[PDB]
């Protein structure tokens, strides 16, 4: 059950683990082929919770791309 | 007369949070620059080890449950790999005036209580309770698991009157057992000191330092913290150790529970050893309460029979209820 | 590019940069279909991902006009 | 309301297992009502017997150590508890949460009576030290003497005695021993000023004490609106929700010789400030005063600026 | 009177709810018992579980695990102290909890089921003239409904404290003491819990947190509350006292009342290689954040400068006080004031951070080790402030720049006076 | 009579964290100032080697994934380029009193369990279990992957009675196999020492040092930590090795798991070799439970038949149950 936020995709790791007694899965956030992040999120997380677990990294990517590819300024 | 609606006894024998440090044996006289034992984290992977339900025997389901790895993060505390001696230090202040409650609604009840405890001190001193307290300070009962399997435990007690030391005691904590209560001249002198502190005849301050000879790099056991679970959330660190300013520590109430392990008069047995004093005297390890109220040997009915009904109990039960007075509590309806 | 000899149509991943609720423009497929004068289904044909599952590629004029109307490229 | 004749400094008091919650809205430093109760109990125990009266407290909090934890998936914090003994059936207990902490604080106490007249300053300070080293401050034990051998003795400093420049110099040399921490004052006037300049939008008062002491993030006119000091919520005192009651007519009272009332907690704004920022050291003294015609049982520190 | 027309529909909805779990043997008797109080005989249910469980706006429940007492809900106004807050003016929907052990919350629901738009739920407690039509029957059912409504919000009257009720002495002006028993302000903590849920959660706060996650605009800010502690009530069954809902499972969260320095018990700033040479490096997160906030204030106002300059002067004074506190915290953790490699600023940093008088810095080192050298420390602090606050060329063109220069000079003079008075 | 609700056994055979250092062979008698093996970082470019989904086995997508490979930072531990011998040092204490639990509810259950363990000790000593523990100390099984492909392994074991060495054992850890339990005079003396420690007749502390001759600059394998999340704010760190202060180290539970690899009585086979004693004795590397509860040979059914219904199993399974008691654990409802 992958999650698609524009060009970003968050996929689970196809076999979980037991952390602290509770079942967890590793979710990987990719921007296409480039692997951006991995988190270990528990089961009984809704897809919204998985979404705003990675929303901060997505927002930092947006800030960096907006500052890096800013157009020129004439005065 | 009746029992007061409010009744509140401030505790005597206030201990400090016992701090841990580490060093080598035969350097324990110069054990003031000994560095603290710190709390680290590590990772554990285990397997399925608890009892399974009868509906969950199911060998394919068991093999499926094995193949999901079980990982935790665990707070740990160890000695350094070149130090074999754990040094645990706390301070203990004895106040005196054990009879007066901090709150009482009835004035006649508190006056009868004051004359009852005054007659109790008049019949005999605190010397039985003070001798048992000096025993629990003599053997290192406050080293809870740090004493188990230790090679040599040695306790130093410093009575500090002014800014320097007034007197010192030197005990071999493994010679003094944890079961029976001996008599020794240094131990009886220490017993006289704690008795004079308990009688209101002074304010006693002691510094207790215990050296356990465990081994190089071995595990020590400070107190564990209480984390109530974040159930619908991520997995938590499933062990947390108590620390005061990055030093492994035992709780004050843990040392206090270790000190008042004096009750050898509970009606169930006498060979299992002393237990801690409390109303409905109950030890958490056994999960079972000695001094049940269906027998007339718990603290509350003994206090009501001594004060309200003027039925003075036996002298060991008077020791028990006086030790409950020193321990303190919030008693009432 | 404006040169039609060197232009290639965008893939579905490149198309999701500008069209979609998670895209950087924040413009849904229905609004982007209404910008191009199409239906939502004919525009969703562009956003499938593989050439087998009924997916055609967007045209040169529609892609550059969509980049004009989204405020991404000026496309004079 | 009363300028003290001299000032005593309880130098470095170490406290273990003190109460942290102290209120149903705050959890940090304990309320100043505990310190006023401490100086009143010290006046009861050793103050009366020396022809001395004690009036107020200055507190500076050299160090703080809360027994808390962050539960690993949330930005909030939970409290660390202790294992109570088992019930009479030996099943379990009922978990009631308490918050313990560790404190390092100094106390500044004012005196008006025959301070240097009947007794010298050193013996007064030494027996007040010996008295205060046998009780508890805020629900937790006063931690007794350890290898801090240096900071033991007090300094009974005459307030108005000497030249005024010499007064500023001896209060500066007393403030030299209280630089590590930061003193605590009441800020009712700044609360009222922000309340009146907020009331142009809406006439509410507790929303002010909410909005005074958080990190207000205002958007792009991304900035953070800020107060110049350390603004904290404090329990402002006690306001009675019931009339006066006689000692006998209420059951389960603490004493049947003392009148009782049912009360609610007044909450206000305090301020932690560096002790060099106040020039007169008698400004920091927290007095508690009663207005028993109505419910106002207030602790504050008037005559502060 | 709405019980004859609309309260009949409310009791029919309650009967349909009670008969949703309706079966032939036991559920038929349950539907019969619901229909006995479903058309007009709800006074029987009010006699059963309507007035037997009542509570006030401040329950004495959380003061202990089980403390016997009456949670009175009085004191609707107490604005005596004009420097405090609390229950002086609640006003906006002062809620009440059902203090007790009554599981019959249907009466608490029916108190508001006809309360909105009808006088039955509002006049059923007292003045039940609308309850004559609210019963929808003769005088017996109306009398039972009026008696249950009167017994619902009835005050206890006879006061009862407990051992587990926090009895406290308060001293009087030159006389004895008063006994005090604080109640737990359940309505007040529920009001601030609703305010903190509206601040922390909610769609406006989510939109503002998105508009601050990126640097875009939105025409209102938001609020964040760090160090909110959580306190639980009761345990696994958080309804021994009411107003503690399913999501509010004993959840009482508390705002911080902390001293300024919470952590760093170890000496975070030693005279190291990178710091002993450059003593004005500012090894502190709070001092660095304050310096960044002071440097961010660079614009000038046409009419706000008269307060903005005073605010900047207060910020500079707070920065100087934080520097003095950092010097004191360094002086508290210097047992051996010994020079090491990388401590090349030891003429100024080792002098201003000078420990107690060592053997090397003896009386023969009365200008080297025991020298009161506050001028060099003040010059280094002024250089660090000028590097942190670089004034503009036309910044002193208004009075704000000259006021900032005078404030920096006065703060440096006060720091030099404190260092010279503390220099032996 | 039923089993108790709570029942917990503290572990005997407590090992410390094993520390790693490096040096040259034939200087191993002077191996006291050998410098520690440090954990460094290096960069790793990961190729594509997993199984594909076959919904993603299109050649263009495969070449597009190969064109942009991902990169990690990896903790690594090697020997120095001039040193060829890894030294691994730890301490192990043998305590004794293995039958007594540290927690119980029923008094009758713990009395029946205590006399069951007492009858087990009376029929035969701890000689079989301590023989197998001395074997797992003799071969350097606690070097998990560091033993694999070693040229020569030598174990020095020192019984440390006072602060100095009481006795010295020297073992060729490759001659003592990992498969079968032989008989040797020095090994039987070590087994008698461990059995005297386990019976409570002494306080046993051992220093175990192992030397493995691996090669110059070769990779050693310390214990491995746990990583929950990974991002660009780190170095995309995907492997973390365990380390005490500044030294590559092995977790104490790893040495403990390699110590109790003595179970040769599991019903599936015996040609595989010993596994670690566990309730439902399982191997994580094989994902499978030997001693399933469907058969009557797991720990819980054997213990309940031995204690409650007095069905004493075979002496091999009695060794297994008592080894599980020595291992410790939480047993109950």
Author numbering:
A (entry chain V): 2 to 76
B (entry chain R), F (entry chain Q): 6 to 338
C (entry chain V): 153 to 228
D (entry chain L): 3 to 223, 239 to 322
E (entry chain K): 11 to 434
Lines from the paper:
In the type I-F system, after pre-crRNA is transcribed, Cas6f processes the pre-crRNA into small crRNAs, binds it, and further assembles with one Cas8f, one Cas5f, and six Cas7f proteins to generate the crRNA-guided surveillance complex (Csy complex). AcrIF24 targets the Cas7f subunits by engaging up to five Cas7f subunits (Cas7.2f-7.6 f), sterically blocks access to the crRNA guide by the complementary target DNA, and induces non-sequence-specific DNA binding to the Csy complex. AcrIF24 forms a homodimer and further induces dimerization of the Csy complex.
Consistent with the SLS result, the majority of the particles contain two copies of Csy complexes binding to an AcrIF24 dimer. The density map of the MD of AcrIF24, which is disordered in the crystallographic data, was clear enough for de novo atomic modeling. The MD domain of AcrIF24 folds into a mixed α/β structure, with a three-stranded β sheet followed by a helix. Distinct from these proteins, each AcrIF24 protomer lies over almost the whole Cas7f backbone through engaging five Cas7f subunits (Cas7.2-Cas7.6f) with a buried surface area of ~2140 Å2. The NTD of AcrIF24 mainly interacts with the Cas7.6 f and Cas7.5 f subunits of the Csy complex. AcrIF24MD mainly interacts with the Cas7.4f and Cas7.2f subunits of the Csy complex. A comparison between the structures of the Csy-AcrIF24 and the Csy-dsDNA suggests that AcrIF24 competes with target dsDNA to interact with Cas7f subunits.
